[PDB]
């Protein structure tokens, strides 16, 4: 159907906008603390602590399969990255502080992305 195609064009466009959001968020992580999944070889207890791990590479795989239906889903995954880090690591650690900084800086990007998603539809 033509409707299914128009819907798919919208998903495709959302994916385009989310890809750019993703790149801007990841630039706020020049240390690359959040680039890849936490290694279960290097933190073998991790899954006892964190039930839903997340990282920028895993978000990117989902993105490129057009697996984000709306901005809310994409923000849920970004929030996991931050929130998982702030629970597993103590307040005095470079990791925790990096998550705080990513959260604060990412907020600005996300604020405008919500306006653009509403605006373009």
From Swiss-Prot:
Give the subcellular location. Answer: Nucleus; Chromosome
Bromo domain boundaries:
9-113
Q: List the disulfide bonds.
A: none
Task: Point out the cross-link Glycyl lysine isopeptide (Lys-Gly) (interchain with G-Cter in SUMO2) in this chain.
Answer: 41
Its tissue distribution reads: Highly expressed in testis.
Task: Report which superkingdom the organism of origin falls in.
Answer: Eukaryota
Query: How is this protein organized at the quaternary level?
Result: Component of some HBO1 complex composed of KAT7/HBO1, MEAF6, ING4 and BRD1/BRPF2. Component of the MOZ/MORF complex composed at least of ING5, KAT6A, KAT6B, MEAF6 and one of BRPF1, BRD1/BRPF2 and BRPF3. Interacts (via PHD-type zinc finger domain) with unmodified histone H3. Interacts (via PWWP domain) with dimethylated and trimethylated 'Lys-79' on histone H3.
**Role noted for this protein:** Scaffold subunit of various histone acetyltransferase (HAT) complexes, such as the MOZ/MORF and HBO1 complexes, that acts as a regulator of hematopoiesis. Plays a key role in HBO1 complex by directing KAT7/HBO1 specificity towards histone H3 'Lys-14' acetylation (H3K14ac), thereby promoting erythroid differentiation.
Query: What protein does this entry describe?
Result: Bromodomain-containing protein 1
Report which gene this protein is encoded by: BRD1
Q: Which portion of the complete protein is shown here?
A: 555 to 674 of 1058
């Amino acid at each position: 159907s033509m409707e299914q195609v128009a819907m798919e064009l919208r998903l495709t466009e959302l994916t385009r906008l989310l890809r750019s959001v993703l790149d801007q968020l990841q630039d706020k992580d020049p240390a690359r603390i959040f680039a890849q999944p936490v290694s279960l070889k290097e933190v073998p207890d991790y899954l006892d602590h964190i039930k839903h791990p997340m990282d920028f590479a895993t978000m990117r795989k989902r993105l490129e399969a057009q697996g984000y239906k709306n901005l809310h889903e994409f923000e849920e995954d970004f929030d996991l990255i931050i929130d998982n880090c702030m629970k597993y690591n103590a307040r005095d650690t470079v990791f925790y502080r990096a998550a705080v900084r990513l959260r604060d800086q990412g907020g600005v990007v996300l604020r405008q992305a919500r306006r653009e998603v509403d605006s373009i539809g």
